[PDB]
Every structure is written in structure tokens, then in C-alpha cells.
Amino acid sequence: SMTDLLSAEDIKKAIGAFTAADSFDHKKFFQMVGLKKKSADDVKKVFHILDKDKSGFIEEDELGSILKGFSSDARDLSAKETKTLMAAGDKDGDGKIGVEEFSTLVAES
């Protein structure tokens, strides 16, 4: 599970920094949660958890629920946050974040 890939302490702090609606900053969240300490293969393992339905893509529903993929206590993303995150991650413009797109988003954080 996520707390086997990332530390629960780091997840707690990361989620806790973004409790207010509209606060989410993907670069800062990825830093805080420990994604900037992970190998390329472990970044992909995190993706696969976030891809809740195992389609190979983080669709809009899974994107709005992204924080819940890290902690089930978390809020849904706000509308502003989902729009800016999708735009940041969806480089090919198809409305979803795929494997490489997620890896790139993390690498650049």
C-alpha cells in the first residue's frame, strides 16, 4: 500500500499542509510526501496505486481523489486545483495523466 512506498509521517505532514480548499501545490506536495526520494520504479508504483481502476491512466475522477490515494482522510481537490493539476500533468492534451506524464510531473518537482 501507499505507506509501504512512502512514509506515513511524510504523508501526514504533506496532507496536513494542504487542508484548505485551493491550497494544493503539486511540486510542494510531491516534495513533502517523499516522492523526491523515490527511484523511478517506485514513482511508477505510486502511480499504479493512484490509478485506482487499473486503466493505465489517472482519469478526472481519480485526479480529484488524488489526495485520498495518499491518505483516506483527505479532502477532494477543488475545481481550481483539478484544472491546474491536469494542465500541469496532461502534456499530450487528452484529459488524463498517464504513466510517463506522472513520472515527469514528479521528476520536475
Residues present in the chain in total? 109
> What minimum distance in Å lies between the beta carbon of 55 and Ca ion?
4
Annotated binding site for Ca(2+): 51, 53, 55, 57, 59, 62, 90, 92, 94, 96, 101
Asked whether 88 and 48 are in contact (CB, 8 A), the reply is no
Among 46, 51, 74, 102, binds Ca ion (CB under 5 A): 51
* Part in contact with Ca ion (CB under 5 A); list of ranges 16-24, 31-39, 67-75, 93-101: 93-101
Closest of 50, 54, 80 to residue 65, by C-alpha: 50
65 alpha-carbon distance from chain centroid: 9
The yes or no reply on residue 100 touching Ca ion (CB under 5 A) is: no
Interaction of residue 90 with Ca ion, rule CB under 5 A:
yes
Supply the minimum distance, in Å, between the C-beta of residue 76 and Ca ion: 16
C-alpha grid cell, residue 25:
501545490
Residue 105 engages Ca ion in binding (rule: CB under 5 A): no
For residue 7, give the amino acid letter.
S
* 23, three cell numbers: 491550497
